[PDB]
Amino acid sequence: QFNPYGDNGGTILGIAGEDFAVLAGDTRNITDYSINSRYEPKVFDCGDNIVMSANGFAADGDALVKRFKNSVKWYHFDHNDKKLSINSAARNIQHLLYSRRFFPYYVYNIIAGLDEDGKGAVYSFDPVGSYQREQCRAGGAAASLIMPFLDNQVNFKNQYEPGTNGKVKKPLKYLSVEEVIKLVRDSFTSATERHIQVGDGLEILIVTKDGVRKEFYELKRD
């Protein structure tokens, strides 16, 4: 029997800063125990200061991204070159996903950018279109390895102030872009050690009011 779905592996990570946002993902593409590519880009600049990554089944992921990029193009045509806000793009993507409620895009999608007040924003989707705005989200193969670490090191969960013994929590101080990138790199280096589908390379897209910048880092190739 024909199985229309597949699993291309990969892992993605989105973090929202105070005035910036990052969307990272490894560059390894796989089927079963084989490597297809050590560098196959997974996170895309979709225009209007929005970045996107559809992780899971690469054929459905490429189709969704391609369709959203197209939706941005037609939003400009139809509404006098108005900029598509991150919240508007998120709602649009919900409707793209739910158009296939009964033959879903097999992907977990994340977008990142800035909201209309200039603050950092990340939105996270399930395959059928449920979405919500988030601060921190790891998606894909090694999501379960990374998210607990981010709960601990970004939101300071289970961390209390010495001397008080559990009475006073550690205060939620904001993180810089340099601090976030460190947590991203360590997240993927740890994931690479314990997850066979994670490795080869790491590509990060950083979003600020100035635009979209890229950073690439090697990962273990075993």
Partner: protein, 211 residues
């Protein structure tokens, strides 16, 4: 998931948890399980998140169009029915949605339960999700119509806490809402971890747990 809603003297309370799971893995600690349809209408969420969001945001479209056409606010009865009729079209197709439509209209406060089968029930009290049994115990033994807004908010909050404790797929935080004739009022996000220890001390409950 645990959601509840009940009618009382001074309107309707709506309380939900915030957990989302993918098997044993907790995919989300804080998801919003109440949808703000309009300033006088709320909707809870249980089942498929996507189905609840899509169809209830679509219900909002239809409830807004109603207002423009008739210049009047839609009843809770009619809104609940529109929603149940959408479910009836994808009957058998695999949707999973359990929600309670909460609001205030000409007849007073209103509460309807609606599910994917097209079921539509009016009632004073409802609870859905994997933890509804735990919530019903607290509600049934403490519910009165003579409830004050302060006590009612605590009841719905304490009822979710009961479920978050025992049910593994329920937890995270509690979101509270109070619906009045002047609209709905949000009463905050309450972490269950912090709330639990607080309730234990102040109430004396959960003696079995060491703190």
């Amino acid at each position: 998931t645990t959601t509840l809603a009940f009618k009382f003297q001074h309107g309707v309370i709506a309380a939900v948890d915030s957990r989302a799971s993918a098997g044993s893995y907790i995919s989300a600690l804080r998801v919003n399980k109440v949808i703000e349809i309009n300033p006088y209408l709320l909707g809870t969420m249980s089942g498929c998140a996507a189905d609840c969001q899509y169809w209830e945001r679509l219900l909002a479209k239809e409830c807004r169009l109603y207002y423009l056409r008739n210049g009047e606010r839609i009843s809770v009865s009619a809104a609940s029915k529109l929603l149940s009729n959408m479910m009836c079209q994808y009957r058998g197709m695999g949707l999973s949605m359990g929600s309670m439509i909460c609001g205030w209209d000409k007849k007073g406060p209103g509460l309807y339960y609606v599910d994917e089968h097209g079921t539509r029930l009016s009632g004073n009290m409802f609870s859905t999700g994997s933890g509804n049994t735990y919530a019903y115990g607290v509600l049934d033994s403490n519910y009165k119509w003579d409830l004050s807004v302060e006590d009612a908010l605590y009841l719905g909050k304490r009822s979710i806490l009961a479920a978050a404790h025992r049910d593994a797929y329920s937890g995270g935080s509690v979101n509270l809402y109070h619906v009045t004739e002047d609209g709905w009022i949000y009463h905050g996000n309450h972490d269950v971890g912090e709330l639990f220890w607080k309730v234990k001390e102040e109430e004396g409950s959960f003696n079995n747990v060491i703190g």
